[PDB]
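Aim 2 progress. For Neuromedin C (NMC), the working sequence is reproduced below.
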Amino acid sequence: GNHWAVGHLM
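Predicted structure tokens for this construct:
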């Protein structure tokens, strides 16, 4: 679906 919380790596 939507990419709400994805890819939170600095």
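The radius of gyration is 8 Å. This observation will guide construct design in the next reporting period.
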